[PDB]
mmCIF file of N, CA and C in Angstrom:
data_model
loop_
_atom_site.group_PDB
_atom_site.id
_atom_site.type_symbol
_atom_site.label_atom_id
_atom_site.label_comp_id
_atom_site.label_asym_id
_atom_site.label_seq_id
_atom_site.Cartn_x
_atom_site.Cartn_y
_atom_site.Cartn_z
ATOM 1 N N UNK A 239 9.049 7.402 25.419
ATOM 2 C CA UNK A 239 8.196 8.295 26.191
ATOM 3 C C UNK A 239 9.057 9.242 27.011
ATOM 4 N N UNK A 240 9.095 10.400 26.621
ATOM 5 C CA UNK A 240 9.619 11.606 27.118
ATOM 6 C C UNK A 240 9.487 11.479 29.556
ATOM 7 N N UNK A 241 10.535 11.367 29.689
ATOM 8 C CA UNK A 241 10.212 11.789 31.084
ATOM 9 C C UNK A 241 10.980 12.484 31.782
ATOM 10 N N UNK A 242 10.594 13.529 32.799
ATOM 11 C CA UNK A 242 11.073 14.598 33.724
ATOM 12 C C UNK A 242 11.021 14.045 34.842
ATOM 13 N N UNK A 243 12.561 15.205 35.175
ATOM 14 C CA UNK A 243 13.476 14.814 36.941
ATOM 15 C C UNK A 243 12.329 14.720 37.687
ATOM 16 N N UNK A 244 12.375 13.574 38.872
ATOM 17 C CA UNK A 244 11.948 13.683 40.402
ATOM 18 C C UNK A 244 12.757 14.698 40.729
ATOM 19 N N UNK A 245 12.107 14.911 41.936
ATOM 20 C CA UNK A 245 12.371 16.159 42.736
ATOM 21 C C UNK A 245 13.978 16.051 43.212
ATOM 22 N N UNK A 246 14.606 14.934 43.216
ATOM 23 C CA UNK A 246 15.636 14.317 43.244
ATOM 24 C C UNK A 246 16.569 14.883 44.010
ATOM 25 N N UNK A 247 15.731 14.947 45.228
ATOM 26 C CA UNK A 247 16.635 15.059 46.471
ATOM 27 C C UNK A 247 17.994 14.145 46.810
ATOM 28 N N UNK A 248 17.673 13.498 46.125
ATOM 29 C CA UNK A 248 18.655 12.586 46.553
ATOM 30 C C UNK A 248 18.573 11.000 45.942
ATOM 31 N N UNK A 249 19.121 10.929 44.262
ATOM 32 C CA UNK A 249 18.970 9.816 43.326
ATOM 33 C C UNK A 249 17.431 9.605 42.684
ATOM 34 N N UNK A 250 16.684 10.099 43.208
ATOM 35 C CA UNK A 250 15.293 10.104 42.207
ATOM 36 C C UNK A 250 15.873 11.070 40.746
ATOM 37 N N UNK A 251 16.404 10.045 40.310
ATOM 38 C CA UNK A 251 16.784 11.699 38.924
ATOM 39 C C UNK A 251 16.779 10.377 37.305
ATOM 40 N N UNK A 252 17.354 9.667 37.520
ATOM 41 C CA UNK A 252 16.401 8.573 36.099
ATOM 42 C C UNK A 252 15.024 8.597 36.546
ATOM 43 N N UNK A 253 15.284 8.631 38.244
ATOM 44 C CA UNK A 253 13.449 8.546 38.653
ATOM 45 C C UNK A 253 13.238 9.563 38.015
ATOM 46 N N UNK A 254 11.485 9.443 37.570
ATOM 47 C CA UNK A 254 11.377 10.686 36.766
ATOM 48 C C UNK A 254 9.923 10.015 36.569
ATOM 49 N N UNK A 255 8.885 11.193 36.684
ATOM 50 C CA UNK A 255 7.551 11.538 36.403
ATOM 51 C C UNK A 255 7.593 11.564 34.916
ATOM 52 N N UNK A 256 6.357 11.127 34.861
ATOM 53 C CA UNK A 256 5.837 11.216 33.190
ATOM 54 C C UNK A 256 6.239 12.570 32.521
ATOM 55 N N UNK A 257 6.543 13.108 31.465
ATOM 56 C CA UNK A 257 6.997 14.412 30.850
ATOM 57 C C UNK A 257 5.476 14.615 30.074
ATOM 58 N N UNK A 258 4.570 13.630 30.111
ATOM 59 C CA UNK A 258 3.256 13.881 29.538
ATOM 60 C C UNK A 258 3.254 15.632 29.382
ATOM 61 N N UNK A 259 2.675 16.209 30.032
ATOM 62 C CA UNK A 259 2.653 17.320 30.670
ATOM 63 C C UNK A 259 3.177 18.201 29.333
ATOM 64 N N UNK A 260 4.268 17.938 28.985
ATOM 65 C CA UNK A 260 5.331 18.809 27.641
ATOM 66 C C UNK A 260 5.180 18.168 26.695
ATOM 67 N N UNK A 261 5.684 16.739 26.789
ATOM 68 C CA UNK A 261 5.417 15.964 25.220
ATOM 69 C C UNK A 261 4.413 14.603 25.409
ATOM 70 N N UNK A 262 4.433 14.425 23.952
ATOM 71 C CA UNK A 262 3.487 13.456 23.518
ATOM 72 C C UNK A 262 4.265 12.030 24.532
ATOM 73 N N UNK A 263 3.240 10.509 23.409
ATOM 74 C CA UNK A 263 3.948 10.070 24.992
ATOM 75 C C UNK A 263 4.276 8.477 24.209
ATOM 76 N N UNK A 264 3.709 7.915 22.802
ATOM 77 C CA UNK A 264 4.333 7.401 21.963
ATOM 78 C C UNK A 264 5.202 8.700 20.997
ATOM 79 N N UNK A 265 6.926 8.666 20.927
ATOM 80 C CA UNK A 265 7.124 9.316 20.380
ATOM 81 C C UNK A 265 8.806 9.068 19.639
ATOM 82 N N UNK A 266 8.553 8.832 18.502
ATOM 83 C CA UNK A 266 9.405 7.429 17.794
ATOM 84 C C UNK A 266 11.474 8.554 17.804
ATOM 85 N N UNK A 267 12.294 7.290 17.948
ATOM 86 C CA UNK A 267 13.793 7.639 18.099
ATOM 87 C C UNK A 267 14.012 5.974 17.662
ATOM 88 N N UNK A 268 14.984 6.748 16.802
ATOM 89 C CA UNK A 268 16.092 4.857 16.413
ATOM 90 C C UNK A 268 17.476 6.240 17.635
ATOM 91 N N UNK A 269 18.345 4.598 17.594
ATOM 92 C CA UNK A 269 19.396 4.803 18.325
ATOM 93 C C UNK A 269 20.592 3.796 17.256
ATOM 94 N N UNK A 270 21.687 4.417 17.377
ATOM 95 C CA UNK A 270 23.111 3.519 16.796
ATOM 96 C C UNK A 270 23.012 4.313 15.548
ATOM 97 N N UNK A 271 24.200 3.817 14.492
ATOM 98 C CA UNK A 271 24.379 3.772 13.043
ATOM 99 C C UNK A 271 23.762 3.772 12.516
ATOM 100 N N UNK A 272 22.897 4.154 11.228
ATOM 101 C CA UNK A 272 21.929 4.277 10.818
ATOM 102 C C UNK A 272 22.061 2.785 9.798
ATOM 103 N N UNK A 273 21.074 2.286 9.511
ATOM 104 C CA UNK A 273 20.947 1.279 8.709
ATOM 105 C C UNK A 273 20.806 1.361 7.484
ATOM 106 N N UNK A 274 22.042 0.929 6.311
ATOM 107 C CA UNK A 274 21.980 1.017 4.922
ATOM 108 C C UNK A 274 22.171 -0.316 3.858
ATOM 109 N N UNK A 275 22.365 0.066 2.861
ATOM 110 C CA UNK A 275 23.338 -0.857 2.380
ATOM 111 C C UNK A 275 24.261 -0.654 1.559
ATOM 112 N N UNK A 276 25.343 -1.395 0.967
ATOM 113 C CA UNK A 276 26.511 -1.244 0.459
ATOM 114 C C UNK A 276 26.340 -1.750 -0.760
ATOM 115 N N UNK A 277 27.285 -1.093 -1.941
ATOM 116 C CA UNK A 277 27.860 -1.671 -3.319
ATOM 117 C C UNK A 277 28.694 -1.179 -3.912
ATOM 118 N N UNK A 278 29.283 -1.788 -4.899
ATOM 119 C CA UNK A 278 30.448 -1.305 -5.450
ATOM 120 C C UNK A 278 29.948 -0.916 -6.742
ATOM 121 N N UNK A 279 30.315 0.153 -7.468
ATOM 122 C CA UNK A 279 29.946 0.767 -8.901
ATOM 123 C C UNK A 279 31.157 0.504 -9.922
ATOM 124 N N UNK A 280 32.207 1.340 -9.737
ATOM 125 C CA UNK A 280 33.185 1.249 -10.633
ATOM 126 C C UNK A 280 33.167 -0.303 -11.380
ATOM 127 N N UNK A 281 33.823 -1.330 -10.354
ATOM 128 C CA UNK A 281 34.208 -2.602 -10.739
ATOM 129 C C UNK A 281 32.446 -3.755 -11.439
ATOM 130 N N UNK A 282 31.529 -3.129 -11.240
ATOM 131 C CA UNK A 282 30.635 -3.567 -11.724
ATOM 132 C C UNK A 282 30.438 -3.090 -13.154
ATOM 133 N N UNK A 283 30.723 -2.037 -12.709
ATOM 134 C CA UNK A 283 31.033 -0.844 -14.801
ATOM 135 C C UNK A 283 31.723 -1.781 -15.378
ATOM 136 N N UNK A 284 32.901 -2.037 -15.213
ATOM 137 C CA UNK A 284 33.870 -2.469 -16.202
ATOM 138 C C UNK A 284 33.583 -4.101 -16.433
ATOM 139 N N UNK A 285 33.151 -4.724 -15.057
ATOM 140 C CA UNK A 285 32.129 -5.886 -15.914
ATOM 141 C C UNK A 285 31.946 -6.206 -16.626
ATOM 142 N N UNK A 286 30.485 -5.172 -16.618
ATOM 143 C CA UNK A 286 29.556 -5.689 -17.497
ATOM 144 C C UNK A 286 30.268 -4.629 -19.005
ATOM 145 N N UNK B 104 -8.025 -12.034 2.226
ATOM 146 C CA UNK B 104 -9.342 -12.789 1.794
ATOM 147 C C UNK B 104 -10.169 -12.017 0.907
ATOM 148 N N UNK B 105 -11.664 -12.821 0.422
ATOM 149 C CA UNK B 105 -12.081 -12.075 -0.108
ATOM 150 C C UNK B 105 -13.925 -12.682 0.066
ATOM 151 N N UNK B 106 -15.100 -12.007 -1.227
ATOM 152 C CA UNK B 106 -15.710 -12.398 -0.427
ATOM 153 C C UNK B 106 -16.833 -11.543 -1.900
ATOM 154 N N UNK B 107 -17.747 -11.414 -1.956
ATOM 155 C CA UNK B 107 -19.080 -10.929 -2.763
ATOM 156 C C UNK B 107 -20.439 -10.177 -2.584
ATOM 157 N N UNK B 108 -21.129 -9.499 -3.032
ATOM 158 C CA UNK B 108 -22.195 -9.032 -2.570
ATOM 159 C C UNK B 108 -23.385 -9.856 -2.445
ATOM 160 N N UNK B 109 -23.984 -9.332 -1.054
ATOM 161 C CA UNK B 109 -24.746 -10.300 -0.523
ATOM 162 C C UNK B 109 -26.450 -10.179 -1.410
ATOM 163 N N UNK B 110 -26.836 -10.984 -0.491
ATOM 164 C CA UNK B 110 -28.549 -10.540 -1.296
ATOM 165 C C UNK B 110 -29.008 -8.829 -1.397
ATOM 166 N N UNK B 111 -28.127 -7.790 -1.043
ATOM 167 C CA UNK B 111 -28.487 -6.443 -1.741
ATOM 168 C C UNK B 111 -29.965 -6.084 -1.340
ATOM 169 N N UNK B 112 -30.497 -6.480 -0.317
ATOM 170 C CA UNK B 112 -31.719 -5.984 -0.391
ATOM 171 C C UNK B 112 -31.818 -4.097 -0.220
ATOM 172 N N UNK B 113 -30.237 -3.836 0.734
ATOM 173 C CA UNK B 113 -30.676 -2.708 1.357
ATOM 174 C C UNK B 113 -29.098 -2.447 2.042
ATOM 175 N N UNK B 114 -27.759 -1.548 1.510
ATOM 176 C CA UNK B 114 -26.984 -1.282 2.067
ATOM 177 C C UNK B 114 -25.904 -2.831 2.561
ATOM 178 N N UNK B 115 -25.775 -3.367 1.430
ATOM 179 C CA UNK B 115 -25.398 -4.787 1.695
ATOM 180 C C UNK B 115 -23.792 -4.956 0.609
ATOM 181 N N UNK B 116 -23.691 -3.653 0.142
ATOM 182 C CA UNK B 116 -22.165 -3.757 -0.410
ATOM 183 C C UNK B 116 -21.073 -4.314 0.066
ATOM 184 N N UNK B 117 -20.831 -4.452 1.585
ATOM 185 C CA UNK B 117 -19.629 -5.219 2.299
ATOM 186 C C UNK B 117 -20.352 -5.967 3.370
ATOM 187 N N UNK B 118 -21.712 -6.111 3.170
ATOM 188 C CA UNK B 118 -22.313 -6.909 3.590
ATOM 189 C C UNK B 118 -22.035 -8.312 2.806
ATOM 190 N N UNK B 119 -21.042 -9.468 3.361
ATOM 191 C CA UNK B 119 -20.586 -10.590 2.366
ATOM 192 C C UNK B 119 -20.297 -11.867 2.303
ATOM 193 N N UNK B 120 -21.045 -12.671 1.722
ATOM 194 C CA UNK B 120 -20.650 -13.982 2.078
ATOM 195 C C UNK B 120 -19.148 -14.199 1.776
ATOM 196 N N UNK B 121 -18.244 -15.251 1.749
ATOM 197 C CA UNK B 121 -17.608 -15.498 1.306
ATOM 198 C C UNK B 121 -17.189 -16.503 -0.334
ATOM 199 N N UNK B 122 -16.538 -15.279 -1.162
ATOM 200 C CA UNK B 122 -16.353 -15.808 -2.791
ATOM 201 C C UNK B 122 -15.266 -16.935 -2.782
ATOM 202 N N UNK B 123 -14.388 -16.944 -1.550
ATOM 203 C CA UNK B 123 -12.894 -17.417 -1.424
ATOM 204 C C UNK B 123 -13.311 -19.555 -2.070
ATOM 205 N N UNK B 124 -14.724 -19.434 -1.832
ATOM 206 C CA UNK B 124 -15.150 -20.747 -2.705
ATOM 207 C C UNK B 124 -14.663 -20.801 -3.932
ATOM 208 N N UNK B 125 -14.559 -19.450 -4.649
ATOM 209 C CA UNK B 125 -14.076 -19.800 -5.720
ATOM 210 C C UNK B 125 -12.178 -19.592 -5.940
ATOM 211 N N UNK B 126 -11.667 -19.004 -4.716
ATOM 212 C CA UNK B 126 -10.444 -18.219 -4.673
ATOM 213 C C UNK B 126 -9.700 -19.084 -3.449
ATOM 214 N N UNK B 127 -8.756 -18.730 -3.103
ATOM 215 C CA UNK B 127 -7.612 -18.985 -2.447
ATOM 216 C C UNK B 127 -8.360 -18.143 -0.634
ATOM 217 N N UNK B 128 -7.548 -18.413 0.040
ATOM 218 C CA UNK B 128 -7.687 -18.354 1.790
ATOM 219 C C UNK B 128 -7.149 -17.133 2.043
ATOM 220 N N UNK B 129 -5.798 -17.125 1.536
ATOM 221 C CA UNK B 129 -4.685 -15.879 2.092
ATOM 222 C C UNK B 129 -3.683 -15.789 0.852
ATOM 223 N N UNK B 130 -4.497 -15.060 -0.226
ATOM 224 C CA UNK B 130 -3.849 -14.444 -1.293
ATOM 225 C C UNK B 130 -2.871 -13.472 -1.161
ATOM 226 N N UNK B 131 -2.062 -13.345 -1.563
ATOM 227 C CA UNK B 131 -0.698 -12.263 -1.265
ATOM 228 C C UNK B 131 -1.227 -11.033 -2.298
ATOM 229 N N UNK B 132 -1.537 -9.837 -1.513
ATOM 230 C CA UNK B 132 -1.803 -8.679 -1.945
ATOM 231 C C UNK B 132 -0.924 -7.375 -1.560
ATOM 232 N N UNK B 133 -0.537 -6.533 -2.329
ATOM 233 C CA UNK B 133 0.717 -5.629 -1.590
ATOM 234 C C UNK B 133 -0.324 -4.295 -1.230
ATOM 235 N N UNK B 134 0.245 -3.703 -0.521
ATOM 236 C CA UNK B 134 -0.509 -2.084 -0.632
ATOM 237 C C UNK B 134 0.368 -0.865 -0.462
ATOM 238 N N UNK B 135 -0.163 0.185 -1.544
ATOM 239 C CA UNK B 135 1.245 1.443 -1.498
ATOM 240 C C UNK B 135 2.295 1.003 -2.161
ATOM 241 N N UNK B 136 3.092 1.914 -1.692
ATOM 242 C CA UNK B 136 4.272 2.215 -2.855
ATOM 243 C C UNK B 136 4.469 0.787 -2.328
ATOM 244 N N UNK B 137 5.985 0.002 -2.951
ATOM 245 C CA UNK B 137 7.207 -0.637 -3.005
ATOM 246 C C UNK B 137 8.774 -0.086 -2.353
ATOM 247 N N UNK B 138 8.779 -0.952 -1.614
ATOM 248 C CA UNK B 138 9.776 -0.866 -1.379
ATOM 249 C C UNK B 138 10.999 -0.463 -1.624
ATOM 250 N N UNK B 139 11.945 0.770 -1.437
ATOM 251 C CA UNK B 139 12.713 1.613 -1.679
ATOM 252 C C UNK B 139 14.125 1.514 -1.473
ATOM 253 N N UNK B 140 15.664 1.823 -1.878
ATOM 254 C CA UNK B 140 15.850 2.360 -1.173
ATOM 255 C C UNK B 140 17.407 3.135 -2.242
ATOM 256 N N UNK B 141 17.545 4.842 -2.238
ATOM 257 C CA UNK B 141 17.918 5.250 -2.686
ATOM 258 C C UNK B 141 19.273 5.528 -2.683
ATOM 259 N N UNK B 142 20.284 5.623 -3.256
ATOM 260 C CA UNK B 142 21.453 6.001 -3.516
ATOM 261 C C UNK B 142 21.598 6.879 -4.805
ATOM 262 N N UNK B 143 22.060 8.319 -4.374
ATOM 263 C CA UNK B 143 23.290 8.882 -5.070
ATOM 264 C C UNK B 143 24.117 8.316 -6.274
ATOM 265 N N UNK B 144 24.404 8.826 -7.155
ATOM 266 C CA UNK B 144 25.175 7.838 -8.103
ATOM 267 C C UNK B 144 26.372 9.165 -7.929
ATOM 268 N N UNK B 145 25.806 10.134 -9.316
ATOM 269 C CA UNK B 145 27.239 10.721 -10.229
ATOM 270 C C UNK B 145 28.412 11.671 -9.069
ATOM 271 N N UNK B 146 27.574 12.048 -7.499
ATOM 272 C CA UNK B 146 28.664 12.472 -6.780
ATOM 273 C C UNK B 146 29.648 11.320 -6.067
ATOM 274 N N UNK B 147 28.834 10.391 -6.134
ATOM 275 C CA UNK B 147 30.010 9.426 -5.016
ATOM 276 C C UNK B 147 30.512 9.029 -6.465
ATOM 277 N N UNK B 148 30.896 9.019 -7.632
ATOM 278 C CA UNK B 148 31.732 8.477 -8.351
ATOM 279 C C UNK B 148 32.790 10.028 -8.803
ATOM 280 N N UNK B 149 32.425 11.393 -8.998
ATOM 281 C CA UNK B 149 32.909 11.998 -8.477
ATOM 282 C C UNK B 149 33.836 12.106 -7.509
ATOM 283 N N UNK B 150 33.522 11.730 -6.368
ATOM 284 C CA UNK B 150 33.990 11.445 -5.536
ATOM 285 C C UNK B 150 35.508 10.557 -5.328
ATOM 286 N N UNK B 151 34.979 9.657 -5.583
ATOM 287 C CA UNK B 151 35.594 8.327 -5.899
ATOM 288 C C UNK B 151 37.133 8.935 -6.489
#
């Protein structure tokens, strides 16, 4: 959920009012490395 | 689950007793596509 500075006179500034106002308010973010998976091709070629 | 049409007198299509008398409780049913997930082949061996 999107949120905007308090008036932050002085450390109100993570403080922060709803951003409703501009954005939506379920509003989806992944964070880190993205999630995949791994394999090997070549050495599976010559395998099989 | 699942389940049958009822006595039909009048708008009774999902109006339903239960058929599961003749069926299972919690049958495994999928919905939509299957599960995905894509890789690239001829550039990452290119690559390679």
């Amino acid at each position: 959920q999107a949120v905007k500075t308090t008036a932050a006179n002085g450390d109100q500034g993570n403080t922060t009012w709803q951003k409703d106002s501009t954005f939506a308010e379920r509003n989806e973010i992944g964070v880190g490395n993205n999630f995949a998976m791994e394999i090997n091709l070549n050495a599976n070629l010559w395998r099989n």
